[PDB]
């Protein structure tokens, strides 16, 4: 299937409390694999997945230096943005970036991306063609113009089409036992009373990887996507994921409702009842 390499970068100013907090967190697919946190005692890039032990000391030194360089760029950015937006020095502000690439099953590029936000709002984003940016406001337009004159899109495109893809392929190779595995969901239904002659039926899916899954409730062959409550798929502390979906049904009619679970680890989807 396709695979992705994503970095989530965050810089947060803290006036009166020193330098901004700066973090990078990397993922291959749904698996955290590297991190940098400026608030650590001696900040360094660190592995977060066992298979990253296959990188030698030079990797950790080089990526640490890169993170420190990035940290400095985001420190300057926080100051610059106060200027662009005419904001005071006393408030905390946040820059966020998502950056990465996706490849198909054959290792060839499907898409690249890099998007920024300031205080939780879109700022600037690389267009799908990897050649130009789109700016959400007049501050971001200043950035776009600077980056255009400096040749930044060419540098970024070279990273996305080249470096990013090559690293992703290597991580998939090294981490194959973890990243190319499938852990099948195990499912069950819980039941809870309500006021009025109704009951809540909750369908759980546990222990699965990758994270993509579909849970539905049906009555009479029809899916009840409207009547359902659910939680976003969530990590469970060991590299697997979980999810639940519930419906409210009439007391005594529980038998007519079925939960359906679709996942890459389920050759035939699961069907279950309370």
């Amino acid at each position: 299937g396709p695979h992705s390499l994503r970095y989530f970068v965050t810089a947060v100013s803290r006036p009166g409390l020193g330098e901004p907090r700066y973090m990078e967190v990397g993922y291959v697919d749904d698996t955290e694999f590297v991190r940098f946190d400026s608030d650590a005692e001696n900040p360094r890039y660190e592995p977060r997945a066992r298979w990253m032990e296959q990188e030698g000391p030079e990797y950790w030194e080089r990526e640490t230096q890169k993170a420190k360089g990035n940290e400095q760029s985001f420190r300057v950015d926080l100051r610059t943005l106060l200027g662009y937006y005419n904001q005071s020095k006393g408030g905390s502000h946040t820059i966020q970036v998502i950056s990465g690439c996706e490849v198909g099953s054959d290792g060839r590029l499907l898409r690249g991306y890099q998007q920024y936000a300031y205080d939780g709002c879109d700022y600037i984003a690389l267009n799908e063609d990897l050649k130009t940016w789109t700016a959400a406001d007049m501050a971001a337009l200043i950035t776009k113009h600077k980056w255009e004159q400096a040749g930044e899109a060419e540098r970024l495109r070279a990273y996305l089409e080249g470096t990013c893809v090559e690293w992703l392929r290597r991580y998939l190779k090294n981490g194959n036992a973890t990243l190319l595995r499938t852990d099948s969901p195990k499912a069950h239904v819980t039941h809870h009373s309500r006021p009025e002659d109704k009951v809540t039926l909750r369908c759980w899916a546990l222990g699965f990887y990758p994270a993509d899954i579909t849970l539905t409730w049906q009555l009479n062959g029809e899916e009840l996507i409207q009547d359902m409550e659910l939680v976003e798929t969530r990590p469970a502390g060991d590299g697997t994921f979980q999810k639940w979906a519930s419906v409210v049904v009439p007391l005594g009619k529980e038998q007519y409702y079925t939960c359906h679970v679709y996942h890459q680890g389920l050759p035939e989807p699961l069907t279950l009842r309370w």
């Binding site: 970095y7 970068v9 990078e24 990397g26 990526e63 890169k66 993170a67 360089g69 990035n70 760029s73 985001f74 300057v76 950015d77 610059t80 943005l81 970036v97 950056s99 890099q114 920024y116 700022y123 600037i124 950035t143 600077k146 980056w147 400096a150 930044e152 970024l156 990273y159 470096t163 990013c164 690293w167």
Partner: peptide
């Protein structure tokens, strides 16, 4: 490996 960012 992440990108090496430049100032905005």
């Amino acid at each position: 490996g992440n990108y090496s960012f430049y100032a905005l």
